[PDB]
């Protein structure tokens, strides 16, 4: 399963000290995110497996110095406006290092430890965003840091900026003297568009898992029926992604006590409640077969970049030869960037439709608009902010999966007359991604809500039924009667009338009253009527304020929830509650607390927790 | 490779007679537009396979229980023809509904299936509306209005008849049916249209994919490229299984060729004044081409498993005794794929139009003349400025339609569909993309053959040439160091630069020989002016002459040992075609609209498998 | 000074029906209604003025032809016919493009004889027209060398004489007395060298685009009547202090058709009744219209003058100045304001859609619709009545496809031929797209008054049954003997509750109309605290008995609000000209049957006399 994978990712990302760049063992996604992120992991140039190809490849090259520094100088073209982030340039460090390893390149020894020192030093250069079609600007600036050019501003660390030739002697470095194809060797990769997608690819990996998982906590909470992940309907469409997703499904959905709220719940009524849940729910396997398909395949292809040599010449000295290509062509990235940024896009699409249903008490299931728990409405409009806000990103995330691939201009006196806009494409799928962050912590602030407004519903409604139990005892009302109150406490969903229980318009009082005028002509054919004003009288007494306890007292069913990982870590290691009018804290405050344990990668420890032994 | 697997997707498309339908036999791309485009193709619905478990399903909906069925498709029956959907998608949407029955879950009867069997083999279809499926309830709503007989709905017969369906039924030897439970919908809830057009979609992707990678290498020959892009060792260190595969045909097709022979001797004169590499459109193509193969193939197998699948609601799990409700009814899969397609056809496109581009500038074309004008007369030969023109227009608008249309999704039908495929728009619109890019190919084929032509001209004017001032030179008794500097101007200058005028003193040729004479004068240093003068007079005597006569010669040979031969002798002798130039009357349409034609009923699959026989 | 834009679109609606000449002169501008009429009306006649043009265009073809001194020219054509044949552009494009490039000639700018121009209106009075190819332009060189092609005889250019038959050009040149032109100095370039393909789409496309937006405006009041909704959204104070022209415009119109509306009567009873449990505001898809709209109309309007211009200008290059001695090098072959400004209103076209996505998705909803029956069944039995949902689904597959094709075509421009033409507009390839777009707007709109109409007759239903219910409820009080007090109770929930959630079995104890009658019995027991029961129990009894029988009986007569209603027009025209009536399971006719009768009539014009009808007396 991919379900699999993506957890090998995660503890990848995790687990790892050391990346090795040997020029045999692979470089993953997990790998460059590792390093970006993390700055404890440091990377390890071996030279048992590389350093006699490398040596060979840059002799022959020695074989056959102002040429090559006069590239650099006209390639230096980008501006500064906002810049390429450190974390994509370090990453592009490591990948350009990487390429050489293969011995292609004809580049120094000398030069690949340079490389490897900076890395482990935290220095990289300030990069522009823009000027690549796909990486020869951008690439130009590590090798302005190489040669020690003043004009190029280096970081160290996250606050120091000095000059290049000042930063290189911080780190025991001597400014290089390119020699023969060094020059072109540098600048001639695709190692910015690589890094980018790198981590593009990391990400879309876990909040794609991240997505899937959530659709069964969706299911819990919405009440929705788990038969449409049953394998049968997807063993006969067997779409890869269709069947895996599902079978996380069934197994999250399989020990479910939400799921026996929800069998319980169509039970009463079930003539005038839906058979089939919406297709946000039912639809959800089928939905993310494409996505996950797409997310996976273009992980393979980013990686074989990764784990390639994007130079031109590629040096064959072995044969004596020159072999002239391109390499350095980013079309691989390019266009798979584009088949994600629309599957991200979808992803959003399925989270706004999730979040559209949970906000509508016609579509709920029992719910209360905008999920405000009240009970005085009028002053708690619950997560309509938020509504608001998922409409926003959705739509923003949309336009923004337009191609880039088919806006290729003719470029460089017309030599470059076709080219891959890599890292233009990578930089939008990445802006999609955040947005989808931003979606992924609303829908989860959303649904530990819904959890919340659930077990609160499952506690009032049994009060209820006390309430009305024990007045029917104390009132002295037939058997007939007391059964038909009953049932009505049970039936009706208590946020319909949680704002004034005891409101003669509201749904309880009017299940109530028809009861009574329903058990009077059953059993005319007047002491009665006394004992059903008595009833009606005392419960405006008892009922209100025991409502109010209950409530005041939960400000367990999730306890049994696969789920639970992801609702403790909101509401206890995040400190959060129930959104109300009584709890002074923005939903900002709420989502933002989630939305960068999602950002840093803690939201993985309840992701894994919840996966656990699957 | 690929490559393998397309041959054999051409070589089941030409050579099926029967498309099995029992439920386990998978149907690829290649039998459904076998089906749409071939009337001779049958398809048979065995019974003894999944007779069984169709008629314990439909029983056990039996147990379990008309006028609902009624009230759904006269609800659905709600397109409008402002346009159509092709009988070809019907008739493939028809044996798609029928292949999603054979499976048993959906709870229909043997009978109905039996007459979806005979109403394709009788070529029997609805007229259906193009549009209001967000993916297909209306479009299979028409098929559904057939086999009730509802005088509302159309039907085909063949290409001629176009009769109610009451009258259609009874032509084929049909009754109405009266629909049984779970029947209605059964019919109508499927992804058949859209994966319909998607199968004739992907089926074309996959033999226009493999018609551009292999005229990629014509385009070597023709524009004198340096086949070195395509070695192994470039690839093989840069691992994406679609450029490794496209550079070892490109390899194999160049290996031994005529045209590269020359590409090497052009090189070899003036090497430090000419493009020491080639440009992108064609060194850049291998890499260029792998996402594109990949895409392509990867949503080859998503149609193809949608194909054969059951594609209903509710499942019929009758060993169980359970209905289960899904949504199988969803076309994702297919949607998305639509889209990415349409990406890929546009970055193939773009290919096309980048290396036509190099093609028609004589900047960037190594000799060829502009527009590929043969002239001589080039005031009233413009050659394929025309075609050059049409170029970007079919490459601007295919840009343009690569657009995703998964992005548009709207909640629908009460909310109820808040996620919706729009499968069907998406491969409606990959299929007009793949429309443009025949027409690009038939552009680009067309602009090839015009330019081996031109090669094989320019070699013979040469050999001309030098023979002509080889013998000049003793005639006038020149010494063998001037012999030696004439000879090599006449090897050295692109002769379409003087073709027009060839004794003219201000273009390159005359221009190049007053250099020589001048070199030749103040090496061997006054009778040797006097015999310059008269080579001068006897060259504006004989030159013109000689040079007219072989290109009238060759307008009344290296492709021969050339691996593209098959496509040339296509071109040329079976579509009745020759050179451009204003001798020729027939106009730049009458050419490419024969090459097209060919393209679309699938007539260039001929030469395509004669030029890659022996390819493993 | 334009008084509102609704009277300039009512402008080009009377123009493209009344006039039966286009003038060609070379002063009296072409508008996109002439243009349209010419395409769509066979018995406009072209008439080339030789007064005023003439001189002008023999003293340019003189200048050329004497600076000159002809198979250049016919070079040119030759290598321009490059299109391939896969569709086509059809008759009614290519007879416009041929006036166009007619109108062009006038200006005395191009060098073309007079012979030709003559040609060319002997050509389009005769419906002589030549199969174009679809594809080919940047913007309109191959297009237009078919109209070459066919003036020079080219035998491998086909004609159509009217919608029949089909010839070689120099057959079709013969039948109309006329004979292969030879072509001189100028004249190839001077045929090929314009935007009149791409203008010639653009025109009707503008065209259409002002009429659909008017239909489009007028019934969002026809909405308002149906939903119920609160026309207050169109108070002229509102769009006074956000004065957008298109917002005021619009607004203007509604507030006028809403005046006096016998439906708006209705609505505000309606929310007389049950203030709490009912919106205080309208739907954005109502409500936000006229801001929505205001931007659409300002579009599609500024696109009409700039097409206009382009319809009236010199396209072709160079530009013979006879009078100073001199060719002019420019590029007004260059239709990149056409261009443009077909990418605009292609998006102001979805947006359109959008509006009439929303205002029918609303419609179909029972909790949106504010008394509707969800997807406007009649019913009464709902299971077999699933009503209008088929056309629901489309209307959401019209607005997808539609929001698609809003993507702009001028973003996509290719360095073309030689690098040369590096930049290039794209124009017919934009104009073909908002073409496209504007057919499923017609659709949409098909779809949206038709349901509109079935709305019309449930409100009309609704007003009849409840008038019904409350007769039976208050004859059963007083045979039944119950005070005045309880008669009163009873009476309110008749009138209170929505007819459609019970219709379906109005006796049935679990649907809201016995829930509200059972309630209201229960506490009027409480206030008058024995044989009050009694009497209760015999007015369930009674009622169980004849209200079904009742309702029924109304509800099949009726298988009035709207003869007040300034959208009678519409509804006749629905009900009586295309012959419809309510859609029910009683209805043998599918809604494929209704929605084509009210498409066909959008296509071919039919609609606007009930426009007309609907906005005389409007200022």
Redesign the interface.
């Given at each position: 399963s991919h379900v699999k994978d993506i957890l090998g990712l995660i503890n990848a990302f995790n687990e790892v000290k050391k990346i090795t760049v040997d020029g045999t063992t692979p470089i993953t996604v997990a790998h460059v995110a590792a390093l970006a992120r993390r700055h404890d992991v440091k990377v390890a140039l071996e030279a048992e497996q590389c350093r006699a190809r490398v040596e060979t490849c840059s002799s022959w090259v020695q074989r056959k110095s102002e040429l090559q520094e006069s590239l650099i100088r006209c390639l230096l073209a980008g501006v500064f406006t906002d810049e390429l982030p450190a974390t994509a340039t370090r990453s592009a460090m490591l990948l350009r290092l990487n390429s050489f390893t293969?011995g292609?390149s004809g580049i120094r020894w000398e030069v690949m430890e340079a490389l490897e020192k900076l890395l482990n030093s935290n220095v990289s250069p300030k990069v522009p965003l823009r000027g690549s079609v796909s990486d020869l600007i951008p690439l130009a600036y590590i090798a302005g840091l190489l040669i020690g050019k003043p004009s190029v501003i280096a970081r160290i660390g996250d606050d120091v900026e000095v000059p290049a030739p000042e930063a290189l002697s911080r780190v025991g470095l001597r400014p290089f003297k390119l020699q023969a194809k060094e020059g072109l060797a540098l600048v001639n990769g695709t190692s910015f568009a690589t890094a980018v997608a790198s981590t593009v690819m990391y990400d879309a990996n876990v909040l794609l898992l991240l997505v899937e998982t959530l659709c069964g906590m969706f299911c819990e909470v919405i009440f929705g029926?788990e038969?449409?992940a049953?394998p049968?309907?997807?063993k006969?469409?067997?779409?890869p992604g269709?069947i895996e997703s599902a079978e996380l499904l069934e197994w999250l959905l399989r020990s479910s006590p939400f799921q026996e709220l929800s069998r319980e719940y169509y039970s009463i009524d079930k003539l005038?409640k839906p058979?089939?849940d919406?297709?946000?729910l039912?639809?959800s396997p089928?939905?993310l077969?494409?996505?996950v398909?797409?997310i996976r395949?273009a992980t393979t292809?980013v990686e074989?970049?990764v784990n390639?040599?994007?130079d031109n010449p590629?040096i064959?000295h072995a044969n004596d030869r020159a072999?002239?290509?391109?390499?350095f062509?980013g079309?691989?990235v390019?266009?798979?960037m584009?088949?994600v940024r629309?599957?991200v896009?979808?992803l959003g699409?399925?989270l706004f439709?999730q979040f559209?249903?949970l906000m509508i008490e016609?579509?709920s299931n029992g719910l209360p608009g905008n999920l405000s728990l009240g009970p005085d409405l009028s002053v708690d409009y619950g997560l309509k902010g938020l509504d608001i806000a998922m409409a926003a990103y959705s739509s923003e995330l949309?336009?923004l999966?337009?191609?880039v691939?088919?806006?290729?201009?003719?470029a460089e006196q017309?030599?470059?007359?076709?080219?891959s806009l890599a890292l233009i494409s990578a930089r939008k799928t990445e802006e999609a991604l955040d947005i989808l962050k931003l979606m992924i912590a609303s829908h989860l602030t959303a649904m530990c809500q819904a959890v919340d407004l659930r077990q609160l519903e499952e506690a009032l409604v049994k009060v209820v039924e006390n309430v009305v139990s024990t007045l029917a005892d104390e009132c002295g009302l037939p058997n007939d009667t007391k059964a038909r109150l009953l049932y009505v406490a049970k039936a009706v969903p208590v946020y319909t009338y949680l704002e004034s229980p005891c409101d003669?318009?509201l749904p309880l009082l009017?299940g109530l009253?028809?009861s009574?005028?329903?058990t009077?002509?059953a059993l005319?054919k007047?002491t009665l009527?006394?004992r059903?004003?008595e009833f009606?009288k005392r419960l405006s007494d008892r009922l209100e304020n025991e409502m109010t306890a209950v409530r005041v007292l939960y400000e367990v069913r999730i306890q049994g929830s696969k789920f639970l990982p992801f609702y403790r870590f909101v509401r206890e290691e995040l400190d959060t509650g129930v959104m109300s009018a009584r709890r002074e804290q923005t939903p900002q405050e709420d989502v933002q607390k989630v939305f960068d344990a999602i950002a840093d990668g803690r939201i993985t420890v309840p992701l894994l927790h919840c996966l656990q032994g699957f």
């Open positions: 293969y292609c029926r038969e449409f049953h049968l309907i997807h006969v469409k067997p779409h269709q005038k058979k089939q919406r297709y946000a039912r639809s089928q939905w077969a494409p996505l398909q797409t395949d292809t074989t970049e390639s040599a994007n590629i064959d072999l002239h290509g391109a390499n062509q079309s691989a390019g266009f798979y584009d088949y629309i599957a896009a979808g699409k399925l439709a559209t249903e016609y579509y949309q336009y999966a337009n191609p691939t088919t806006h290729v201009h003719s017309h030599n470059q007359d076709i080219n003669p318009t009017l009253k028809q009574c005028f329903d009077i002509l005319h007047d009527v006394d059903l004003a009606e």
